[PDB]
Each structure stands twice: as C-alpha cells, then as structure tokens.
Amino acid sequence: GGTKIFGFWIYLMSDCILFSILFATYAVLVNGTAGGPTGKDIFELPFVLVETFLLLFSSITYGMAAIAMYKNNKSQVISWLALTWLFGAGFIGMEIYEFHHLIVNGMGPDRSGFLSAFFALVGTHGLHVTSGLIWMAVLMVQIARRGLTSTNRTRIMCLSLFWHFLDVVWICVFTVVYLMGAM
Amino acid sequence: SVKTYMTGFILSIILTVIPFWMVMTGAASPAVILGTILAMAVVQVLVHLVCFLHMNTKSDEGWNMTAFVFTVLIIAILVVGSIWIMWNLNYNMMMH
Amino acid sequence: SGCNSALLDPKGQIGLEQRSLILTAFGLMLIVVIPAILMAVGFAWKYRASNKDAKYSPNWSHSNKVEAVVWTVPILIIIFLAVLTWKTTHALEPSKPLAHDEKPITIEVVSMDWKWFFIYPEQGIATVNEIAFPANTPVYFKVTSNSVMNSFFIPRLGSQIYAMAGMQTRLHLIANEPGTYDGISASYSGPGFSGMKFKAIATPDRAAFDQWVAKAKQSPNTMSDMAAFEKLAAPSEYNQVEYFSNVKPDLFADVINKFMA
Amino acid sequence: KLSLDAVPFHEPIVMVTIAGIILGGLALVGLITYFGKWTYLWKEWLTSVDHKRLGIMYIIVAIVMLLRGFADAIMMRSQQALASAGEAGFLPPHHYDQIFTAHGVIMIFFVAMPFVIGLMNLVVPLQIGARDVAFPFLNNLSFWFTVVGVILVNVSLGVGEFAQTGWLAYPPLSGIEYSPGVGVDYWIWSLQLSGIGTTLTGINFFVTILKMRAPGMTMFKMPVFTWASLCANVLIIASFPILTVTVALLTLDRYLGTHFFTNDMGGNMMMYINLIWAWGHPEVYILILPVFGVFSEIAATFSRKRLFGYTSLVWATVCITVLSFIVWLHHFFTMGAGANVNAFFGITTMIIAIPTGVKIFNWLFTMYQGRIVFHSAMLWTIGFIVTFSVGGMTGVLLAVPGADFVLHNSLFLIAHFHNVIIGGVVFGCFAGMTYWWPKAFGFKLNETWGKRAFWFWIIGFFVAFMPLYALGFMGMTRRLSQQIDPQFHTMLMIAASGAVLIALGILCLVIQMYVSIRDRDQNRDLTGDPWGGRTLEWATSSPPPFYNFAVVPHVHERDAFWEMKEKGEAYKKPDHYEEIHMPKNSGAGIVIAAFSTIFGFAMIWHIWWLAIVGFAGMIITWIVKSFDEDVDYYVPVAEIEKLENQHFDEITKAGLK
Ligand code: HEO
Ligand SMILES: CCCCCCCC/C=C/CCCCCCCC(=O)OC[C@H](COP(=O)(O)OCCN)OC(=O)CCCCCCC/C=C/CCCCCCCC
Ligand SMILES: CCCCCCCC/C=C\CCCCCCCC(=O)O[C@H](COC(=O)CCCCCCC/C=C/CCCCCCCC)COP(=O)(O)OCCN
Ligand code: HEM
Ligand SMILES: [Cu+2]
C-alpha cells in the first residue's frame, strides 16, 4: 500500500533530476539569443502571474480533495478533483495560448537557442501538467466507478505528490525562466 | 489538514505576489530584486514541501526527507557543475 | 607501452612534461596495484582449499589494524597524486603561454570536413593538412572547427585540444627537436575521420621555416575572400597538402563568426 | 503513407546475409515454439511478474545481444587489422561507423545493463527475504522496454542504419544537418525507451530493498550484493533522467529543428557532452557496483570465510554512489576548460578511486586465511581482481588532466574502459551466471567448460587490449577504420588474435550452457544450498518456488542463512502455512512495449500517423491496466504444502535437520 506512494515519491525525485537538467540547459542557453528576443520583451509577466496562481490554486483544491479523501465523502473528492482539473486545464490552455503567440510569430523553438531551451523547459512542465490532467481524469473516472475503496486512495496520494511537485517545479520555473529574464 | 493547507495558501500567495510586484514595479536595485525573488522562491518551495507534500522527518522511517535531501544535493551538484563548467568553458571559447 | 612511441619519448616540452607526469602517476599506483595483484595470487595459492596447514580462520571480519592501512595507503597515494595533479594541471594546461624567450608563432587551425586548414595570420600563408614551425620556438594554435567537433592532436608534441564550431580554443605547443611529427584528429567527425592526418614539419631553424613559407607563397591559388573557404570546406575525405599564397586579413575570425553570428 | 521508410533497407550490401541469418534463426525459434511449448512461454515467461523469470529473461537478452555486440567487435578488429599495413578492408567508412556505434550501444545498454539488472532481479528479492519486487508489474514492463530497445537496435541493422556518430552521439555530428539519416533516430528512440525501462527498474529495486526487506534484517544486515544493488539503483534514479533529458533534447534538435546543441543559432554543443557524461559516468558505476556485490558474495561464499570489511565495504559503496556525480568532467578534459575545473574534477576522479581500492583489498583479505575453493565463479573473481586493478590503475592515469590532454581519445582510453568493463561487469555477470545458475534452473553449470571459458576470456582479453594500451601510447586514436598506419599493424594484429581468443571463450561459454542443459539430470541441486552459501537466497529450493519463501525468515543477523546453518535452525518444517498474495501475471507489459515498438519505429521513420496511434496505444493500455482490479491472487496453502514438503523431501534425503 504505502510502497506505491514511496515509489512515486522517488520517481518524483527522478523528475526533479530531469527538471534540474532542463534548468541547467536553460541557464546556459538563456544568453543564446541569436539576434532574437532576449526574453525580457516576450515573457509578459502578468500573464505568468495569472498562470502562477492558476496552478497555485490547483494545488490547494487538490489538497482539499485529499483531506476529503481522508474522510469518507466521495462527492466532495469528485468536486474538488473536478475543480483541480479545471484549474489545470486553464493553466495548460494559457500555456498553449502563450506558445500559440510565439510559434505563429517568428519566435518558435527553432528561432534561437534561448527560445529552444525556454520552450523545452516550459513545455516539459506543461507536458507533466497535461499528464497530471489525464491522470486526474482517469482517477476521477475510477473514483466514480469504484469509490475511495483501495488502490484508488493510493492513486489520490500519488497524484497529490505529482501535482504539488508540479507546482513546486513551476515555482522554480516562474522564478528562473520568467521573472529573472525580465530583470 | 484544513489549517495547514490554508496556512500554505496565504503564505504561498504572499510569497508569489511580492516577487512579481518587486520585478514588475522595480522599486529596488537589481541585486536586491534577484536576491529577494530567489529567497522568496526557496521559502515558497519549502512551504509547499512542508505544508502540501506533508514532508516530515519520520515519514516511512525516514527515506522521504532523506531521499529529498539526496535529490536536492544531486540537483545542486548537477546544476552548479553545469553552470560552473559551462561558464569556464564558454569563457575559454571566445576571441578574448 | 612502446618505448619509441609518440607518448613515450615525446619531442615537445609540453609532451616531455606530460610523459614525466604519466610515468610518475603510473609509478605512484604500482606500489598499490602491484601489491593488490600479488596478494590476489599469493593468498589464492597459499590458502587454497587443499593447503590444509594454512591458518584457516573463518569469521574474521573486522580488523581495525588492517582496515586502517587499507584506507590510509590509497589516501596517501591519492593526496600526493592530487597535489601533483593540481600542479601539472595549472602547469600543462592549454592556453598557457608556454613561458619561453621566443615569439610564439600563431597558427590558426580550422578542422574542416575531413581535412585540416592552417592559417598563419602573420605570414599570410594557408595550408591544408600541413604545418611548419621553427625548432624550440613556441607555436600558438587558435583551434576551431568548421563542421563538427574534432581534436587537434600532435601526439609526439603532446597535448590535444577540442576544435568546436564557433569556439576558439588556445593550444600552446613547442618542438624541442626538429623533424616531421604526425598529426591527427582525435575526435571522430565522420566518414573521412580516418583521413584527418596532417604533418608538422618542425623546421630546424627560423631560416628553414622562412623557406617553407616562401614555398607556400609560390602557390598560384590564394585564400582571398570567404567564398573560397566554402569551396575548400566542401566535404572531401583524403586531401593532399595544398598551400595558399595569401589569406584574408581576418579569415579565422570570419570562420568563427559564421556560427557565432 | 509509409513516409520515410521506403524500399531501400540494405540491399546493395552484404548485411542482407546477416539479416537473412537473423530471419532464419527467428523462424527456427518460432517453429520450435510452435511444436512443443508455445502457451507456456506466454503464460509463465513473457508475462511474468516474478523477479526470477524476469531476471532470467534479462540475462538471456543480454547473452543474445552479447553475441551481436561481439560480432560487431570482431568485425571492427578484422577491419582495423586489414587496414593497417594493407589495402582497404571489407568495411567502408560508412558501414564501419555504424559498427562501433552499434557495438557500444548494444554492449552498454543491452548487454551490460540487462545482465546486471537480471542478476539484481534474480538475487536481490531472494537475498532480502522478499517474495517479489515492490512493483511486480513495473518489472515486466521495464524488461519489455529493454526488449523494445533491443528490437529497435536490431531493426536498425536491416531497415536503415544505426548512427555514424559514436555510442554517445556527440551533438554536432549527431545533429540533423550532419547526420540527416535515420541512424541517430534509431539511437535516440532505442536509448530513450531503454532508459525509461531502466529508470523504472531502479525505482522498483530501490523500493524493494528499502521496503520489502524481511523483518529483522536492518540496513547493515543486508547482503553486500543488496547494498551494491541499492547503490546502483540510487544512481539509476539520479542519473538516467539526465539520459532521458539530453537524448530528448537531441530529439527536439533533430525533429522540431530546435537549437539546444546546434552550433549555428545560439545553441551550445558543449552542453550535450556535459549532460551526456554527467549521466555516463554514473551509468558506469551503475554497471560496476552490482558486480562488486556479486564478487563480494562469491568471495565470501567460495572462501568459506566471512566477508572481511562489510562496514567498510558498504561505506565504500555508498561513497562511490555519492562521489560519482562530481566526477563527470573527467570525460572531456580536452574540451578546453580552465585548469581549475579540470584539476577539481581530476582530483575528484582520483578520490573516487580510494573506495574501489578499499573494496578490492577487502575482497583480498576475505581470501586471506580462507578455504578458497577454485570454482569457476572464484576463478572469475580472481581474474576480476587482477584485471580490474590494472584497468582502474590506467583509469586514474587518464584521471590526471595533464595526461588526459594527451591520452583522451587514444586506444589507451579504449583499453581502460574495456579493461574495467570486461574484467568488472563481464566477469561479474559470468560469475553470477555460474554462481546463481543452481538458484535459477535446478542444475549446475558444467565446471569443466566454465574454467575453460574463463581461461580463454582472460588470456584473450590480456592479448586483445594490452596491445591497445601500446597503441594508445603510440598515438592511435579511437575510431580509425581506413588507412590506419603501418606502425600500428603489429599491435592491431595481436589485438585481432586476442579478439579471436575471446570469441573462443564466448563459444566455450555457449558450450557450457549446452553441455549443462544436456546434463541437467546428471547433476542437480537437491538441497537448494550448493557451494556452501552464506546469504538468504540458498535457504530456498534450487528452482525456488514462485513465492520463493513461505516464512519470510527472521534473519536478525548479518549473514542470516550462514548463522542458521551454524546454529542448526536452518531447515525447519515451519508448520502452519498462511495464504500469501502473489501478483497475477499480466501481459499488459508486452502490449505497452509493443506499441512502444510501434511508437519508436514510427518516430525513427517519419510515419507520424503510426506514431500517433503508437503513442496513444501505450497510454490507453496504461489506462486500461489501471482499471484492472484483479492484480493479485492468493496461492492456496495446499500448494505451499506440496512445494515445501517436496523441498524438504530432498533436504531430508541428504543431511537435513
Ligand atoms: C563500469 C566500467 C568502468 C569503471 C568501473 C570505470 C572506472 C574508472 N574509470 Fe572509466 N570506468 C569504466 C568504464 C568507462 N570509463 C570510461 C572513461 C573513463 C575516462 C575518460 C577519459 C577521457 O574521456 O578522455 C577516465 C579518466 C576514466 C577513469 C576511470 C577511473 C579513474 C575509474 C576508477 O573508478 C577505477 C577505480 C579502480 C582502481 C583505481 C583500481 C583498484 C584500486 C586499487 C588497487 C587501489 C586504489 C588506490 C590507488 C589507485 C592510489 N574512465 C568510459 C568511456 C570511454 C569513452 O567512450 O570515452 C567507460 C565506458
Ligand atoms: C493522443 C494523446 C496525446 C497526449 C499528448 C500530451 C501528453 C500526455 C501524456 C500522458 C502520459 C500518461 C499519463 C498518466 C496516465 C495513466 C495514469 C494511471 O494509470 O494512474 C494510475 C497509476 C497507477 O496506479 P496503481 O494503483 O499502481 O495502478 C495499478 C494498476 N495498474 O498511478 C501512478 O502512480 C502512475 C503515475 C504516472 C505518472 C506519469 C508521469 C508522466 C511524465 C511525463 C514526462 C514528459 C517529459 C517531456 C517529454 C514528453 C514527450 C515529448
Ligand atoms: C513520447 C516520448 C518517449 C517516451 C514514450 C513512453 C512514455 C511513457 C509510457 C508509459 C511508461 C510508464 C508505464 C507505467 C505503468 C504502470 C506502473 C505502475 O503503476 O506500476 C505498479 C506500481 O505502481 C506505481 O505507481 C509504481 C511506482 C511509482 C512509479 C511512478 C512512475 C511510473 C512511470 C511514469 C512514466 C515515466 C516516463 C515518463 C516520460 C519520460 C520522458 C520520456 C506496479 O506494481 P503492481 O503492484 O504490480 O501494480 C498493479 C499492476 N496491475
Ligand atoms: C569482449 C569483447 C569486446 C571486444 C573485442 C571489443 C572491441 C571493441 C573495439 C575494437 C572497439 C572499437 C575501438 C575503436 O576503434 O575506437 C570497441 C569500442 C567500444 N566498446 Fe567494445 N569490445 C568488447 C566488449 C565490450 C563490452 C563488454 C562493452 C561494454 C559493455 C563495450 C563497449 C564499447 C564501447 C562503449 C565502445 C566505444 C563505442 C564508440 O566509440 O562509439 N565493448 N570495442
Ligand atoms: Cu566518468
């Protein structure tokens, strides 16, 4: 039972290593602006801010879902999971919206090394959030079909680790790629 | 655990708003803005670890904080070795 | 370990110091590795399973006496090797100005596609798969690549450096003895990698290097304009030695600026 | 839309003979499966969530890919011997450059990683007194990801090419502009799937060792192979993600046209070498630590003496685990970095040699004052000490930056890493085969052919790579295929002869695998505890039960089984056998891997429609397997009685208790 949570925790440590590699790649390639955007002129910090407490609220509503899972209510866990999925879907939509206003322009990942590394770091965080959204949808389906009986509350406690680790990675992301790029 | 999540909700908001405010509105020399956003990000990361991830010394007989400490050490080694090496590399690759 | 090889008996000061370092490091580890092998065979023969008169003592795990020397002797050999490593790494590094009383000859190296290009900015000469420098005169190499990473390497002169596109690496070499020294790329670069061999004719005196330059200045073809470089940078595996009369005043920089931009 | 695949596979060349031989062998194996056991292979292997069968299949894949890797290496030695002082060889530069790249990739990721993972999979759950790994379905899936990597690196031989960049695919040559072919795509999409499988293996074994231990076995009461596997799994967890990133960062370089490592528009190629070696050396210690545990167990077992330096031999393993992440720059000393970083990483590389030396001396003193029986495994251990000491000594000779500036990519580096890899991992993976063959399969390997294989291997290696040290000292660099030099001909011919001797050694190992199976009945391990045995894996029957333990023994001491043999309480009829839940075999590992093979082959060749339905085939099966609720079955106590009584029937037939 509790081994799965520990196994997912050390997989999250592996993902910490992966994101650290991506962060090092960005921190080295950040100055590789081949006569293109310097990051300061394209990051649009307010658009990040609405994003950053759109994934911050998602961790809090997943927390509510988890503490309801400690209780026996299933409607509350499904409602909080749906709210978390809505917030995560909004976050991913904003990520695509920012990308769709960079790839349509001559600002894509092929434009420069800096843009490639920014696209890789933020797109990998977004692919982790999208994997979390698919996992949350599947877990909601399982909860509806079977309930918080067993190996479904274990999945809740592994997806809580996943989602909160994702929000910590995004804390590092908005601290480093965004923000610091624009002074 | 309602209190700890809400404790990690106002703290998270107040440590994810002041960095954005300091950066967007300036009001501080670059060196204080960077140091303060970095400090607020390390503190917000620790708040999310202790409040949201429910990190604790005992866990399942250690091996969670211990695993996280080892992972942080390896992340720091890898990042500072991929910046220090590449700073020394990129310096020695110039016309100079 | 060939006695008359390139690594052993080098013909360069930065290679002679390199061979001294290799020998002293190899000696430092013999007094440890040789006891290891000698005990691996000695314990096996002495104790065996049929040598019934040996002190067959099982369940003897801990020995503060034995483990102490077992930990300390590698510690001492590695502390001495680390002091030596620090000294010889801050001493034998490339980009070290080689501490000589002669003006270093600047040879701008460009590892093109399965050939080597050399540009003497001061002499104006440009050569393919061939260099020349006076004997006991420092030579300064601005090694860069044009297509893919290579490794400028003259094994007899010692020390190699990496040639990367858009990046200038500094390599100071010197030839204590006159003669022809084989040169190679030590980093695999493609199908023509086995053909990236150049010759380093260490002329006996500055007069023979002026003769070699004058011979190169008699080449009808000249290295003028960057468009010629692209013609020479065309993929070709085994290129014969080719000389160029004069070069563009800053051609090596313009090679790096193709990539650095 | 077949997209980039098209008709040209390898027709104008004589690799179609190799492809036809492979197809004929596959057809023969298919027929042999057809008449005889065909559902058994599906129902007991190939779907297993049992650590013993997954480990055996890992080792079988390792041997089968070792045959191809050594074929590539004998072709390389023949080409280099012919080219030196002679005309061009049978391999043009195009083909030969796929030979060293495929040799290094197959040998590292599909001959050494699977062999070490198979040994760990087979032994660690037994040694720690665990019925199965912590994640029994993440073990079959990881094995099948190793298999999809194997399938991709073998399809590369027939369809397309397998990269002409090197076994790590340095960035500018592996870029889409200088390697527009599908070879680097085969490299990327085999290595990434294999790395995912290996990361899952590392997670599984880390949780198994930390959480599935028998009650009473503390951290410092575990066997030393368990400590070594724990350290190698720490490294797998903390290093293979790097391999997942950089390769993926190369993938976006070749597919999306990004500029992480392109030398054109701001990308930094030197970053790829930094990342690939920050993974690479930790992967080297991932390969060497488990065979350090294997040799610790074999020396303690065949010296009839307690392992000398357990606390020192566990703390040296942990120091190697933690110090292997500060060393990696010693792989690119000649990049042009400053003296400070080069000196620091050289000093770190020399400081990571004290723990290995401490381990070597601990094994030497384990032999000291012991009853050293010269079994084939003990011969492998002695040869490992003798060869690995030389390989490490030459490794620290390349660890001084002042000497790696002149020996970086010579044949001295080839001799270093081949000396350590062979006399380490390969000797450990053959000594584990000999040592744990009774504990997986009930018969014992033929000791006569095992000794012959060891002697052929040791002699051939000492005359196939000792010449390479001289060639490295002579200025020969690594990947020379055409027109090497006249001076290099003598040592390249001696190296070719040594490679032939190693071929004879591999053939003697194959004959040992055949002469033993042929004599599977004219030898046997009735007791379950052959060759003495001090750890808690020999307390079971020789073909250990599917649950592998019916009591989860109390241990409460370091050696465990040696203690209970000494004080009598070794073979005790337990009595009441409680029902124990064992994971149910699931074939969902095969399909998820199979779509991965659909995903990989449709990503190497640009059939995006098949990759979309291949990537979405992995996910939906993962979703479907999530819905599955029957994941474990309780084995009836009647079967536990039948198997345990059968084991004690043989214990009693002999000395018993
Ligand atoms: C798993 C196999 C394995 C192992 C165990 C090692 C172990 C070591 N390796 Fe190697 N290596 C391995 C496999 C490789 N190495 C490589 C590359 C490589 C390079 C690259 C240099 C370059 O790229 O130019 C260096 C410097 C070393 C050094 C070392 C050292 C110092 C050790 C030490 O850990 C050895 C420690 C053991 C010793 C030292 C002997 C026992 C100790 C005794 C007896 C006493 C100790 C005390 C003293 C020595 C004072 N290795 C490469 C890649 C080559 C390439 O493609 O570029 C591979 C595959
Ligand atoms: C056509 C679709 C296109 C989609 C494009 C966007 C990318 C989507 C990627 C989705 C990846 C898969 C998401 C997870 C789906 C499965 C979830 C699941 O099974 O949850 C339960 C599952 C198993 O629970 P048990 O109780 O053990 O189950 C017992 C029975 N088996 O819980 C877990 O612990 C699994 C956790 C899964 C974590 C997944 C993490 C994914 C990380 C992605 C990294 C991406 C890196 C960037 C590169 C991406 C490629 C370019
Ligand atoms: C597109 C780019 C290239 C990559 C393509 C492939 C992408 C990944 C495809 C899926 C891989 C992972 C499959 C995971 C399957 C389920 C794992 C699982 O739940 O295993 C359980 C254990 O449960 C766990 O959750 C395992 C421990 C925690 C593991 C967490 C990580 C799992 C893998 C996530 C994906 C990793 C790779 C992501 C992409 C990386 C970048 C390419 C096994 O124990 P049992 O008791 O047998 O479970 C019941 C079985 N009926
Ligand atoms: C035991 C029989 C083996 C022989 C005869 C052998 C021989 C060779 C030869 C001739 C080369 C090419 C050297 C060069 O031209 O630079 C080579 C390269 C290599 N071998 Fe082996 N090898 C063997 C086993 C192994 C094993 C067991 C491994 C590791 C598991 C391995 C890993 C490598 C690697 C990584 C390379 C370099 C690949 C590259 O440069 O891209 N080999 N080997
Ligand atoms: Cu290394």
Numbering used by the authors:
A (entry chain C): 22 to 204
B (entry chain D): 14 to 109
C (entry chain B): 23 to 283
D (entry chain A): 4 to 660
Paper text:
HCOs are terminal respiratory enzymes present in all three domains of life: bacteria, archaea, and eukaryotes. HCOs receive electrons from the respiratory chain and reduce molecular oxygen to water. HCOs are multi-subunit complexes, and their constitution varies among species; however, subunit I is a catalytic subunit common in all HCOs.
TM0 is only present in quinol oxidases, including bo3 UqO.
